[PDB]
Design a protein around this ligand. Structure first.
Ligand SMILES: CC[n+]1c(-c2ccccc2)c2cc(N)ccc2c2ccc(N)cc21
Ligand SMILES: CC[n+]1c(-c2ccccc2)c2cc(N)ccc2c2ccc(N)cc21
Ligand code: NI
Ligand code: NI
Lengths: 172, 173
């Protein structure tokens, strides 16, 4: 209800101000509601942060939801992944940056650990179901390193590189 | 050029980030740590981004210090994946104060353009060693998967499995 009107205000405030610009006052302003209602639904910011990311996590589903080849016996997995991956990182990255920002905030924010471990959740499940539970962790580990390389160092996205390295891990 | 005060300024910035992270990192915070004035801390590093860039590059020079400490990484016979996975399990030796603060600096670039240059030097230490012992493309993935394997452990309190890390790294060779 309001948790919603105020949650989208958190993703809008991080996307814009980055975590550092997120405070109850900060979101209460976006959501356009009283300071006491923001504080009500979310006692601490860590809660209003898991809310934010737990909702973001969804988006990843909707995505796999849209591409069938991912759950398809053949197609590929690697080509499909490299492909769709270049999409999410395509052009304006205000979305991925807020998502990664939060997810990585689990480095020093304990409350944010459980949600963080629910990252690839939207594929980590699928991959281990398509392959094994050692290749699942693997693939998500390559994706992370591959995505961190682009976002943190200005290196452009190399889809063939990624489509190339993803295969090596996935056995036959 | 007032070098020693500046050394202890960068020395405190790391201490600060290690026990308080970036959240509690700023001129007042570092100046109080190094025990320097403050206009001294701002004198050497105009922006915070400046000190962060600095702190990072100094800690990250230890990576080149270990790659040297294990010549076996170059032995063209030696199993790189295993050696790579072992020295890594070493860097992760408990209460990763070293690791946690470096990566936090490394990852801060996500939203700070100024930190993107040092963020490009994160795996510079093993650079010549990976170019000469594999290929440029296999080379990038080792890093990508090393950073990936590292996030799982730091971001989710799950423990490092060198044995799992040697298989993954191998699968790419
Ligand atoms: C959860 C982030 N994440 C990952 C991802 C990155 C690193 C490790 C695991 C998954 C991803 C990976 C591939 N190949 C293709 C699309 C996405 C994606 C798409 C949308 C979104 N909103 C988050 C997304
Ligand atoms: C620069 C961080 N880093 C990496 C590393 C982590 C992820 C990607 C690339 C390199 C590393 C990787 C291996 N195998 C062995 C030791 C280290 C290491 C040792 C010390 C340090 N201070 C930073 C270190
Ligand atoms: Ni598509
Ligand atoms: Ni050693």
């Amino acid at each position: 209800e309001r948790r919603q009107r105020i949650i989208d205000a958190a993703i809008r405030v991080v996307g814009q101000k980055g975590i550092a610009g997120l405070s109850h006052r900060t979101v209460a302003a976006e959501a356009d509601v009283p300071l006491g209602s923001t504080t009500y639904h979310f006692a601490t910011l860590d809660d209003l942060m898991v809310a934010a990311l737990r909702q973001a996590n969804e988006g990843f589903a909707r995505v796999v939801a849209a591409h069938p080849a991912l759950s398809d016996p053949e197609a590929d997995l690697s080509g499909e992944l490299a492909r769709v991956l270049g999409e999410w990182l395509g052009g304006d990255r205000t979305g991925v940056e807020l998502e990664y920002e939060l997810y990585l905030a689990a480095l020093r924010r304990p409350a944010l650990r459980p949600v963080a471990a629910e990252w690839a959740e939207g594929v980590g499940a699928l991959l281990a179901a398509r392959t094994d539970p050692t290749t699942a962790r693997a693939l998500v580990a390559v994706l992370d390193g591959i995505c961190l390389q682009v976002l943190l160092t200005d290196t452009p996205y190399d889809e063939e590189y990624a489509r190339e390295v993803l295969t090596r891990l996935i056995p036959v």
